[PDB]
């Protein structure tokens, strides 16, 4: 496998302090109102913490 190299790199798309907070990650969001029978269309995978 190609070897990973750990060299720090300089800022891009943001100032050095922060990271990309508003990046979209595919993970379902749960509504507080109970849904009796409705598939989430995306399994939450590993359920336990």
């Amino acid at each position: 496998k190609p070897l990973q190299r750990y060299i720090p790199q300089n800022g891009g798309f943001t100032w050095p302090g922060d990271y990309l907070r508003l990046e979209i990650v595919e993970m379902p969001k749960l509504k507080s109102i109970n849904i009796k029978k409705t598939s989430l269309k995306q399994k939450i995978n590993v359920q336990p913490v």
Partner: protein
């Protein structure tokens, strides 16, 4: 240490870790306050609860048990709700007099639907055995099968 070990042992399933800490109420008085913090096992998300199977159970009890165990928050739900549902179902069936009607297991965790699949049982095979006990002073009875 003894309290922590005893609390961990006696409530192993629900609680993942119990921490005991001491904080001085006053520095000179040497009197202290003891704080117990409990962290139980949790699920990343549980939204609704359902019971499948249990043909003998009327719909009224099905609605009642569902209303009894409604989670307050849909995030970081502890693992006590499934045990509570199982306990309620087992208690109802045992009160009815059937001991072998038990909750099979739980499914629907992928979709965040805690569903308890109750599996019932029926009498299948009946057999008979004939035995005869002997008499002796060995204090351990022996049997002859006929």
């Amino acid at each position: 240490l003894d309290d922590r070990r005893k609390l961990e042992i006696q409530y192993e399933d629900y609680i993942a870790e119990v921490e005991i800490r001491t904080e001085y109420v006053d520095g000179k008085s040497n009197h202290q306050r003891v704080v117990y913090k409990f962290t139980p096992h949790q699920f990343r998300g549980i939204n609704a609860i359902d019971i499948k199977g249990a043909a003998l159970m009327p719909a009224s009890e099905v609605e009642r048990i569902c209303n009894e165990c409604l989670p307050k928050q849909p995030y970081m739900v502890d693992i006590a709700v499934m045990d509570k549902v199982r306990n309620r179902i087992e208690q109802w069936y045992q009160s009815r007099g059937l001991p072998f009607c038990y909750v099979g297991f739980f499914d629907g965790m992928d979709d965040g639907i805690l569903r308890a699949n109750v599996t019932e049982a029926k009498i299948d095979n009946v057999s008979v055995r004939f035995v005869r006990p002997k008499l002796t002073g060995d204090s351990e009875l022996e049997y002859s099968v006929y």
